[PDB]
Design a protein around this ligand. Sequence first.
Ligand SMILES: Nc1nc2c(ncn2[C@@H]2O[C@H](COP(=O)(O)OP(=O)(O)OP(=O)(O)O)[C@@H](O)[C@H]2O)c(=O)[nH]1
Ligand SMILES: Nc1nc2c(ncn2[C@@H]2O[C@H](COP(=O)(O)OP(=O)(O)OP(=O)(O)O)[C@@H](O)[C@H]2O)c(=O)[nH]1
Ligand SMILES: Nc1nc2c(ncn2[C@@H]2O[C@H](COP(=O)(O)OP(=O)(O)O)[C@@H](O)[C@H]2O)c(=O)[nH]1
Ligand SMILES: [Mg+2]
Ligand SMILES: [Mg+2]
Lengths: 427, 430, 430, 51
Amino acid sequence: VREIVHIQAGQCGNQIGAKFWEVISDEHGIDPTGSYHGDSDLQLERINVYYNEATGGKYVPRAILVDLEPGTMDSVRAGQFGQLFRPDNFVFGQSGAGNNWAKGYYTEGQELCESILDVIRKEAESCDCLQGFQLVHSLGGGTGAGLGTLLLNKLREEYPDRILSTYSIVPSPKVSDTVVEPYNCTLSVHQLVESADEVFCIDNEALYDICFRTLKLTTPTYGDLNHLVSMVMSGTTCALRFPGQLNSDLRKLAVNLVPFPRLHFFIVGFAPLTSRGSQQYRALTVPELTSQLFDNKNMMAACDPRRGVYLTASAHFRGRMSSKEVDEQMLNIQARNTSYFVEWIPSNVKSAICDIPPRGLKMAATFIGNTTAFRELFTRVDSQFQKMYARRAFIHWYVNEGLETVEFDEARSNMTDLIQEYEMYET
Amino acid sequence: MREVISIHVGQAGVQIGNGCWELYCLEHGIQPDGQLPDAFNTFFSETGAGKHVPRAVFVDLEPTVVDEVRTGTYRQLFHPEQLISGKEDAANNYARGHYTVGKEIIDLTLDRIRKLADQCTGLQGFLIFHSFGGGTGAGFGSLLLERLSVDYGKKSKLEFTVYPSPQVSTAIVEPYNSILATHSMIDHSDCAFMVDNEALYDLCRRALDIERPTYTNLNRLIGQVVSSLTASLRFDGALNVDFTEFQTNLVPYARIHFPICSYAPVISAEKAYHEQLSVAEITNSLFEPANMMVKCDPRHGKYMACTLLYRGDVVPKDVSAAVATIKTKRTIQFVDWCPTGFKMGINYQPPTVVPGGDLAKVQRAVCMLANTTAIAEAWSRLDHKFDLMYAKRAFVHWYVGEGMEEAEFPEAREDLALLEKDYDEVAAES
Amino acid sequence: MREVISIHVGQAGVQIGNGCWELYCLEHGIQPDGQLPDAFNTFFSETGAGKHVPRAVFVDLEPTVVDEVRTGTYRQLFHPEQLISGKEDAANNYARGHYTVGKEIIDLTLDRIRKLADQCTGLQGFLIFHSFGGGTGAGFGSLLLERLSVDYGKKSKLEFTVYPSPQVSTAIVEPYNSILATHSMIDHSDCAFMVDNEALYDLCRRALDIERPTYTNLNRLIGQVVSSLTASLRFDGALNVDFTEFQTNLVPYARIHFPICSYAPVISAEKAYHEQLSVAEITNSLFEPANMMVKCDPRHGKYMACTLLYRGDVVPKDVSAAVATIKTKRTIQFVDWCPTGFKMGINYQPPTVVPGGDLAKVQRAVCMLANTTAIAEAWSRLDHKFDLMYAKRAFVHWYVGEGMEEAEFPEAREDLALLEKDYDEVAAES
Amino acid sequence: EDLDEVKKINSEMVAAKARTFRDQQLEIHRQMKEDEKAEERSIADMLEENR
Ligand SMILES: Nc1nc2c(ncn2[C@@H]2O[C@H](COP(=O)(O)OP(=O)(O)OP(=O)(O)O)[C@@H](O)[C@H]2O)c(=O)[nH]1
Ligand SMILES: Nc1nc2c(ncn2[C@@H]2O[C@H](COP(=O)(O)OP(=O)(O)OP(=O)(O)O)[C@@H](O)[C@H]2O)c(=O)[nH]1
Ligand SMILES: Nc1nc2c(ncn2[C@@H]2O[C@H](COP(=O)(O)OP(=O)(O)O)[C@@H](O)[C@H]2O)c(=O)[nH]1
Ligand SMILES: [Mg+2]
Ligand SMILES: [Mg+2]
């Protein structure tokens, strides 16, 4: 019944996934040894969505871990919740990542893909009504960026009906950490457009901004950074796992938010966030959450929606609250700021409520939006790639793995067409 | 004896039904499990011994809402086969509900309903609840009604559906599902009532002193109207009204069936001390636009026929005087060709309260059902919203990929235009 | 049976009414909760189990005074729906209350008034209270009366308003509001009684030993006059007087309606022992300018109509003797074309004192209502003050910015001028 | 005709108290939940952030 299969790719995907599983394990109340010790019977109602049952009261998540280097698996095993994962599901290589898209896609991708597909196929048969697959990877280096596209393409070939959704991290415009990110991201965009139904883009620079303003972290680390992304994932799937006044699964979200097949890149947001010295003052209520969600500063993508126009957007609420209040807030925000929204799609803001709020929070909400502000992110990488590829001899590193230079021009051509389609639908 | 059957489709139908049966158990006096601590045959079936079973069927593709009843306190009352659950939502897609997933489960529900009808030897009528915006409510409901219309023939299939609110919308594809479902109802539904959430929210905020209502309060108010409609067939009275009587008098034609609903007195506890609430006071409150369950002002349109149902200590003398007083109002418009317009019915069963509820314990109450041309205002809003979407083909790709042909969209658009033309033609005068 | 509806506007209307209702409840004998430990229809309405509710609507644009009643002792008596409070007051601006703020809340109040009138089947008239100098008082009252003129037609709309004092004033823009109010009042109002704050202040010490009274003491005096006026409709009497009886006799012309009021005997607790307080004393002391509640000397003007209302041990023989002696007073002048000019009515119920009141339990009392040309003295003062205002355009910008058109100021000035000539022409002899 | 108002009046008194009990139960529970949530934020900052 509506099970979900989780896939983690590369260094960034594995560390985010490790924090992600720690969140759901805490939410359901699973001891690190793998035995249930929680306090509410509602937690065991639908644990089949993310967890499998082993003999003896031990639960094992439907987790597939993929990397080309073993060092990442060493950290995963040594982690607090490392023992929870199935040892056979740890699939890894024995060579360096390469920091290259073509190297990951062609040379080692073919060797690893057969083993990874079989391992996933094991978990695919252990679920009655597997709704869709979930992928965690970054577009920067090439391990997740390169291999993730190949795996995503194969999954679509095997399971066309299922909803393929990915959570991708884009190269930051200023804190980019590789001389050759624009090449890797541009090549990855072509496969992402045609394969994945739903794509969520998150940028590190926005994450650093959010932590500094609101959370006031003096020395933030990746653990604090990935906690917010783990919150966003947990809220999205909350409808399947728990009761609510208005259930809304992923296939509901895809129908509402996507007007046309190619326009499916989304921007996500989370609320509430408060400095741990300021939580005394906040009269946290439904209107307070609405202000945080639609505030431009809380967005985890470094693209201002105000400069663009809004397409269909949805908001999911967790906790106990009045249905009328949620409905009125969405109506007020839609009518107050009519300049932001397109006129020809009324009722832009979809609502949904789930009954149980997360730990510690009396109520919480998550925001997912679709807008043409993504053109700014694509403009940054397009301009950088143009100045990269002008010195055409830098392509030689990708040529060694079999990548012909004509692939770069075609990838930009498809990428340029995506901008033009976004430009056209602005009016 | 003389039986009725209820069908609940979609999320809204199940939650509305949960509130409805809560009132029925208290009014009829049954434990949550079904044991005793009459009209019992009319609503419930007797399984021998001391246990009763309701004549209700719950259908939804979402297992979640059904499982809440399965794990709820009332689980022992509900017979396990009566609870039908699917695997996944219809994704708010009418094509998905009507063609892909609905056909996988339609035969299971039809067989159970036919099985249930065998025990209802004196059955007359069906009640189906819908949510127009939801995919299952519209996609599955249209398929179910098409099957039931040919299966049972001449039976009164009454419906009670939730029309989309004028401004409060939770589904973006809601206009698409509303129009396509409307095409189905106008052909296969004998008589279908409408309500909207936005008017209920305003009424629950103004009349009742409830600051922040939820779906729980809205469901209970709807259940009160349904109980009042069925109270004539469940208790003695000076003027009993059958389902055939409603069908003949409410509708003047076939395609103009759509009635409107209202209820009074909607009053909180502390106000009930402060007032007297005679028959004249409750009669006047019905026609005020504030109390209307659909956000449309009757003053823009006219009244075609009206039906009033009375419960409690009502005396036929006072009803006649109150009706005569209403006719003297120039603010209420009636067509020249329907001077009578009114049918009154009286029943002796007072309204039943619910502990921890939102309503008072009034000695008497009145239900209002009528047909008016002001409902054409709501049709204009939905028609305009659909044209804006279809001008740019904003969501065609989702529906076509689920097996529904694109040519069905203009057909539904044309059918709605004829309905609007019919209402204008009938509202005309010579 | 026979009912009167009371409407209160502004701080003056509400706080005077609070004094009125304390007097009314103790006189009839109904507890603050509406229970008991007749002529109730005159000002009270009945609810089933014996709880009483007054026939009143309290309206003000500032919620402060209304909230005081809500938290006050009398909170149980009034229905919460009858206490209507606005958001922001008219800020002593006639235009603001007439156009901007008053029109926001006018529709709600009229529905409340119309809804109340249905239970008042024997309704005979409306009593409305205002402050002339205020913004909400005069400004909101003008709109209310203009609507009620077409809503109900031939119904006696009597009023009781506080006219600005000749010298004591607490508002700079007071002359603007009064004249604009005067224009609205003179057209639609059937008969509006007039009192001023300054003469109320003077008698409150001259007639009884209170060195520094407040609004509380003055309002009790106002309520006593109102109670005497409505006592004829409430109790048995040797000579019944109805509202239309006052309306026909008091006014000889349409625009000369404005009467004056007086009351006697007003005496402290101890001093009442020393004087017999017979019928002769109460009747003779009425005509003295000291007891007049409008600071205009009757000797300057003339008498054209007088009305006497008696409550006590009054015997008709003494009334004839007292009136005959009054006509022998050369100090009192009457227009030759009105020789009789007297209507008297006798009621048996004595005045009822307030525990904590400031009046003695006098065995017999009498109320005085008359119409005199001496009020032309008061009008000329307001006209002179306005001309000083409008010569230099003192506060035109405030009123113009609130939607009022500047051309209304000369029109209102002309209307007051025409009234001044009309009073002079009527007072002229032939 | 005069009998049925007693039915109205008796339920009228008792169910106001019933609503009063429901509201009093609700605020007390939220007060207890407030204390628990006060402890939850305490361990969040005084323990975890201080750790
Ligand atoms: N008044 C009221 N409306 C409800 C309630 N529950 C659901 N609804 C209505 O149902 C509408 C949406 O339908 P869904 O909840 O998605 O149910 P559905 O018909 O199965 O839709 P799908 O799952 O997509 O097939 C909302 O707009 C609500 O107005 C309720 O308890 N009370
Ligand atoms: N005699 C007497 N006069 C009162 C009483 N209460 C208010 N007033 C009069 O009300 C007049 C002004 O009233 P305000 O409240 O200031 O103004 P308003 O008429 O309510 O209109 P706003 O300007 O909107 O407040 C003053 O001149 C007072 O004499 C009272 O209890 N007794
Ligand atoms: N937020 C976050 N980012 C990370 C983490 N680990 C790595 N990254 C980012 O991921 C980007 C590329 O990582 P890389 O090892 O090349 O992944 P690859 O694309 O699959 O090869 C770098 O810019 C890092 O900043 C982490 O734990 N948290
Ligand atoms: Mg649903
Ligand atoms: Mg005032």
